[PDB]
Amino acid sequence: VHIDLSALNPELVQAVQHVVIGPSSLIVHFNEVIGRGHFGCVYHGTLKIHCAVKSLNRITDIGEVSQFLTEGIIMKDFSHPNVLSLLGICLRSEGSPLVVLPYMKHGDLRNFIRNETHNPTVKDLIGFGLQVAKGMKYLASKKFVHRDLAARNCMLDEKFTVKVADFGLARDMYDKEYYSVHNKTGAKLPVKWMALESLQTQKFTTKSDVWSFGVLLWELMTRGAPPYPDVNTFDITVYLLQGRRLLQPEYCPDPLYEVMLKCWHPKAEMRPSFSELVSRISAIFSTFI
Numbered sequence: 001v002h003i004d005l006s007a008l009n010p011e012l013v014q015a016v017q018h019v020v021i022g023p024s025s026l027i028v029h030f031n032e033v034i035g036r037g038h039f040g041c042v043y044h045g046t047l048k049i050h051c052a053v054k055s056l057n058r059i060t061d062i063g064e065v066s067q068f069l070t071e072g073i074i075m076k077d078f079s080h081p082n083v084l085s086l087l088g089i090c091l092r093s094e095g096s097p098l099v100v101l102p103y104m105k106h107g108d109l110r111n112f113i114r115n116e117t118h119n120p121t122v123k124d125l126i127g128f129g130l131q132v133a134k135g136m137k138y139l140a141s142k143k144f145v146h147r148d149l150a151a152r153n154c155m156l157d158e159k160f161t162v163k164v165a166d167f168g169l170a171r172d173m174y175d176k177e178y179y180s181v182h183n184k185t186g187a188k189l190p191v192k193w194m195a196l197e198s199l200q201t202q203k204f205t206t207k208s209d210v211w212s213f214g215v216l217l218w219e220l221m222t223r224g225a226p227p228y229p230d231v232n233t234f235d236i237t238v239y240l241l242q243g244r245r246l247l248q249p250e251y252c253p254d255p256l257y258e259v260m261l262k263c264w265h266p267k268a269e270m271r272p273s274f275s276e277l278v279s280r281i282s283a284i285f286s287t288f289i
């Protein structure tokens with residue numbers, strides 16, 4: 001893997017020095033896999049900054065190198081406390097580049113809320129939801145559409161700060177169960193998180209991210225129950241069109257369920273913005289002790 005600066009959009013050339021990590025600056029501990037995606041494994045690494053280093057060597061070919069760099073450059077300029085940051089990319093003589101992310105001590109949000117070790121309160125769970133909403137408000141303000149928002153796709157650091165993850169160079173399928181193959185297009189889709197219109201057109205928007213966020217809130221309040229367990233894959237469209245939504249979890253406050261129903265409005269344009277979600281959830285959160 002060689003970097004040809006001329007091949008890039010000339011406006012981005014200056015950003016390369018800030019995204020590329022010199023191999024001498026990074027040590028990666030390949031002895032133990034700490035995480036797995038469809039595109040490769042992840043390992044502990046030290047930059048002493050502790051990091052998660054993701055290999056992309058399960059992919060046959062990584063595509064256009066200039067595009068990969070461009071994706072990295074665009075990703076690295078995102079900075080928000082509820083969005084996973086890119087520390088950089090590191091080139092290795094043999095194999096694809098390594099993607100270098102901050103280490104997230106407590107892993108993905110779904111597994112965290114399912115863990116018997118931890119006991120977040122209803123207030124804590126709502127706060128996790130608020131943090132996600134803030135990250136998504138940021139991403140939406142950058143006109144970035146996530147396309148795969150779900151509890152499995154957010155992570156928690158050592159201070160229990162929630163970060164929207166699984167985007168840009170960290171994008172992957174980290175739990176294959178929840179992705180079904182479309183018969184016409186072949187795309188593997190997170191159907192149980194998708195908006196009605198996306199199930200029909202396969203177009204994703206910020207308003208379809210809002211639908212997914214509604215599902216994520218439901219996951220939080222059920223402590224990571226699988227949505228629609230008694231529905232099979234693409235029959236979700238028929239199920240929803242019967243006039244159905246996920247039921248109100250026992251400990252979900254009534255106004256938070258109302259927020260969920262708004263996220264699942266049949267008219268995409270009538271769903272709340274992430275700014276409105278931050279406002280509404282902040283209020284509900286403030287009522288708890």
Ligand SMILES: COc1cnc2ccc([C@@](C)(F)c3nnc4c(F)cc(-c5cc(C)no5)cn34)cc2c1
Nearest residue numbers: 034035052054103104108152153154165166170174
């Ligand atoms: C287990 O220890 C860690 C610590 N930090 C990590 C940071 C990123 C990642 C990385 C690059 F895979 C990643 N980036 N975004 C996501 C994400 F949204 C979800 C997951 C994830 C979910 C499951 C289940 N396993 O991994 C992994 N993700 C993995 C880490 C693993």
